[PDB]
Design a protein around this ligand. Structure first.
Ligand SMILES: COc1ccc(N2CCN(c3cccc(C)c3)CC2)nn1
Lengths: 273, 40, 255, 236, 236, 59, 40
């Protein structure tokens, strides 16, 4: 492939460099339309800018935490982090979010990876070996209440059991209602005068539930869960302007008030170098 | 070799090697030729 | 003697002529078309009023003055009250449509000024409150009036800050969306053909707007000496290939 | 039972590896795809669409005005604007090009810089745009500027001028984050003759300026952007 | 010894994975199969059999009577019953259809709603059943109702009427657990003319109503049912 | 008008059955042409024959 | 590839792709045609 062809002096009536940008086109002008060039080859394919590659590496999408401790006398397991759910979403952490929102609709399979590490912040004789259970409680399913509900039987709901310190990995097909995931949605769930606005009203993929299967030892053990997400088989439509201001909420486009100028001011003139 | 039955379980896809910027760079209704005048 | 410059669009019982055009944009290089069976889901036969809905409606005019910040209309909202297009809209459960948008602004060879005319698929607005305040329905359904970016923040309304496109992105990059400029010195109209763009084959016309049309002054209007300091901008829009499905009782929407 | 040996790296999680995994939802059938206009395949497809450069960066809070390069009637010989070419920083940084370049470590290729004139139709002007390849200072006067890559632009019916910064380089890749060894030059613009307004007209006229990449362009070695960060996880 | 590397996920137990295992009972011979009528292969086979809907839900303890929709002689213009179509909740919820739908997250397809009349043979009646697609309110009077999907039913020799709620939807799947965006409409029924009893006869007559799915139907993404739970393990 | 002026007018034909339009919104919903004043000096609008009965009276 | 000798040790079975609701939806002795009268 040639990156530049050889081109010499020109004295024409045919001027490729004068255009009318009002038309909305970006005319494909090249170095050889306005200087004299020599042949050179590309030596490159643009492999690593493919959208599959761009969205295809694992990104941290969520960090939560649960603890193993005596539940005796706990009136609210959920509240003691005896167990914890995660109303699943990808808008939480901003790194991957800015990348996805370069597109309007996106479609891809997900390959999640869950790392769990334990901490024992206060005096323990040892480090116990805990098994985590991660169970996907899709919408319309019983929601745990206690850390050892009938729920956790999860006879019809996919669940994975792995050890703290290890990692669990499993992918799931693209479970969108539509043909693709909306990255934006300028609508409502119905014509209500007070119903929410935006994506949130589409993001309804349930929540992920985590718990330790082990009963309690004499000390307490903090287990912190990190969920990583990798898109595989990516398809993206309609590019948009990149995010400039900071994010404030999962699912709304809102930016913070009295934010700071995002364009760097010159130290000098327009004329400055 | 796929070891698994479902398609979601296969590895990453392989390069589009599609590439056609004209839907974005030249969505004009009447074709523009480089070198010919923009507005006639 | 054909110029890129003169054009005629006849759609239904209405025709537009421009003698100072700058080509026309067809979003994503695709022209509006009906919904194919292979893509269909709802089993209902759809209704295609054709020429009674696919004609040109001219919205009320705006006034560009030196202080203007820009205006924003949503589709199909802007047309919610135009003739039979609008009736069909409130009466069917689902509908689908593409449009021809023609924005008009003429001046003289002594004026200067340049407007950006852009179509943004799925333009989800931001609340000026920040945090996770929502933007109430009425605020994103201004109707033919559209939203005036130089109007004041209101409560439950969107933010109207132009350098941020009403969503946290910079004005400068709106050029990645199908758009055309109106530069008084060149141009006097902008025309964009919009194919139907959605993640579902057909949708509700009232709970979801699928494009915002935005006209934004970028190089300020500058009139000749002792000229009146303003120009009107007119927007005329025509639904094209419209289909309605799931007819019934007639939606009632807030406000 | 087949005898195996495990190697160093067993059990590691590399966020960039690409392997098979069991599906959690065996046998599930995804929604059919329907057609949607606009599919993107390569980021290289989109960085060829031009977007506006806030060249007039001299303000103090972001404003529509930093997109406008002003022009003065009747000045002769003088300089319209100047900038270095660190596409990952400074004026370029918020543009779509700048914004994507920042997802990669290295770039190579030609850039297309165009200027669209917005002055009254009955005015006229001749400007010179000059690209100064690495190795010399930003030009200080047109004489200096005109000895490097340049285009005399004659403002006419055809409203925009497209200047190309041809890839001039020893090393075949440069860093997107500004680096010296790897630096690309300067871009300046001067009056060639001068802007002239018709009667009954007055004041400043402005140029809009765009940037996009030539088909020439290469970007490689993906990394994280300095353009976005956060202090606590967001919630709904 | 062949060199290997283990990946992330090694040692995990995913309740949904499908692999081989050693048999604990090597060489054991299972009892021969004999023929048994009734084999089921798909849950889609059984949700097409219709079952009764406790439409008359207005009681206070479960009774045979909530299966009976009453009809009054001589009323004109008035409304016989109304319900939304959240097949995973409310009247539908205990029906076989409702009961299976609850094992899945998403459903799509047409529903078949039929009414069998049980009044004396010498009586007569004309009813209108109306389906109101998402987007409008439950109809408030027949005029409103008759502008959407409807069937005038004439009570005759043929005892049952089968109304179909054709799949009317933007999005190709809806949630089985009630959700707004995803909501399906309303179903109402009104006197078209009115029930008329023969002489020597009196009181209320009832309609029985059934629900089953059309062959159209799709259910996907299995999950756990809210319809059953427990607090301690059972024993013998 | 002078050659250096400009204007955009809408001409509308309203078929029998409605009143003479009272504002452009009303007018623009019937047969109409947006005329852009340019180099080409004249605009030709056609009142297409819209009628139930195939002849009308001249009086 | 089965690694084991016994049939119980193989993975899950593969979709019946049988599907015939008529034993449940139309177990009537004399065939009913849709469109013809139910009771003659
Ligand atoms: C905004 O775009 C997206 C893109 C993907 C996505 N989902 C979240 C839910 N997720 C998922 C689906 C099934 C099971 C589990 C654990 C997670 C798939 C990706 N959510 N939003």
């Amino acid at each position: 492939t040639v990156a530049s062809i050889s081109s010499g002096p020109k004295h024409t009536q045919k001027v490729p460099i004068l255009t009318a940008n009002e038309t909305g086109a970006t005319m494909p002008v090249l170095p050889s339309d306005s200087i004299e060039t020599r042949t050179t080859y590309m030596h490159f394919n643009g492999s690593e800018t493919d959208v599959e590659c761009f969205l295809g590496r694992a990104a941290c999408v969520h960090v939560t935490e649960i603890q193993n401790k005596d539940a005796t006398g706990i009136d609210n397991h959920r509240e003691a982090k005896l167990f914890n759910d995660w109303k699943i979403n990808l808008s939480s952490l901003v790194q991957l979010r800015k990348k996805l929102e370069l597109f309007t609709y996106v479609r891809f399979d997900s390959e999640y990876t869950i790392l769990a590490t334990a901490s024992q912040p206060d005096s323990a004789n040892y480090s116990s070996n805990l098994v985590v259970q991660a169970m996907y409680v899709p919408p319309g399913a019983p929601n745990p209440k206690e850390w050892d509900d009938y729920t956790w039987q999860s006879a019809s709901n996919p669940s994975v059991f792995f050890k703290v310190g290890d990692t669990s990995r499993f992918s799931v097909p693209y479970v969108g209602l539509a043909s693709a995931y909306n990255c934006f949605y300028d609508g409502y769930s119905h014509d209500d005068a007070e119903t929410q606005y935006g994506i949130t009203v589409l993001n309804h993929m349930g929540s992920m539930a985590f718990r330790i299967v082990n009963e309690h030892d004499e000390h307490k053990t903090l287990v912190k869960i990190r969920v990583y997400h990798r898109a595989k088989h990516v398809e993206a439509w309609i590019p948009r302007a990149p995010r400039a201001l900071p994010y404030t909420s999962i699912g709304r486009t809102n930016y913070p008030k009295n934010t700071e100028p995002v364009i760097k001011k010159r130290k000098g003139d327009i004329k400055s170098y | 070799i796929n070891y698994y039955k479902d398609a979601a379980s296969t590895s990453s896809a392989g390069q589009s090697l599609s590439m056609d910027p004209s839907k974005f760079t030249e969505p004009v209704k009447d074709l523009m030729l480089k070198g010919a005048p923009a507005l006639n | 003697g054909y110029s890129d410059r003169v054009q005629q669009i006849t759609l239904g019982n209405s025709t537009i002529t421009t003698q100072e055009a700058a080509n026309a944009v067809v979003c994503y290089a695709e022209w509006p078309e009906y919904l194919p069976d292979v893509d269909a889901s709802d089993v209902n036969k759809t209704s295609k009023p054709d020429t009674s809905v696919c004609r040109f409606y001219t919205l009320d005019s705006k006034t560009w003055t030196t202080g203007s910040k820009g205006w924003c209309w949503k589709l199909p909202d802007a047309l919610k009250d135009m003739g039979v297009f609008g009736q069909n809209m409130f009466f069917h459960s689902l509908g689908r449509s593409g449009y021809t948008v023609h924005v008009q602004c003429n001046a003289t060879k002594f004026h200067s000024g340049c407007l950006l005319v852009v179509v943004i698929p799925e333009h989800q607005l931001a609340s000026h409150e920040g945090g996770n305040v929502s933007v109430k329905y009425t605020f994103t359904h201004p109707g033919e009036r559209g939203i005036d970016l130089s109007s004041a923040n209101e409560v439950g309304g969107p933010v109207k800050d132009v350098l941020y496109n009403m969503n946290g992105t910079l004005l400068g990059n709106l050029l990645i969306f199908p758009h055309q400029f109106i530069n008084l010195r060149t141009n006097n109209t902008a025309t964009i053909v919009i194919p139907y763009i959605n993640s579902v084959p057909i949708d509700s016309m009232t709970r979801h707007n699928n494009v915002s049309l935005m006209v934004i002054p970028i190089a300020p209007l500058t009139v000749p000496t002792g000229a009146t300091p303003s120009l009107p901008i007119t927007v005329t829009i025509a639904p094209m290939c419209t289909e309605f499905s799931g007819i019934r009782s007639k939606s009632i929407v807030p406000q | 039972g087949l005898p195996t040996t495990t190697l160093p790296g067993s059990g590691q999680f590399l966020t960039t590896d690409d392997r098979q995994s069991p599906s959690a939802l065996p046998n599930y059938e995804p929604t059919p795809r329907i057609h949607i206009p606009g599919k993107v395949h390569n980021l290289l497809e989109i960085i060829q669409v031009d977007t506006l450069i806030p060249m007039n960066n001299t303000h103090t809070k972001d404003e529509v005005n930093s997109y406008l390069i002003p022009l003065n009637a009747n000045r002769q010989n003088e300089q319209v604007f100047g900038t270095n070419l660190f596409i990952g920083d400074g004026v370029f940084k918020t543009t779509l090009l700048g914004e994507i370049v920042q997802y990669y470590t290295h770039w190579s290729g030609s850039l297309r810089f165009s200027l669209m004139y917005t002055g009254p139709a009955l005015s006229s002007a001749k400007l010179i745009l000059a690209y100064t390849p690495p190795g010399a200072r930003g030009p200080q006067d047109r004489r200096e500027a005109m000895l490097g890559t340049h285009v005399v632009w004659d403002i006419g019916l055809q409203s925009t001028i497209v200047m190309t910064i041809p890839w001039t380089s020893g090393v075949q890749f440069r860093y997107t984050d500004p680096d010296t060894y790897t630096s690309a030059g300067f871009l300046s613009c001067w009056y060639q003759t001068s802007l002239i307004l018709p009667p009954e007209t007055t004041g400043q006229v402005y140029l809009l300026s765009f940037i996009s990449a030539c088909p020439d362009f290469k970007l490689r070695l993906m990394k994280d952007t300095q353009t976005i960060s956060q202090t606590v996880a967001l919630t709904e």
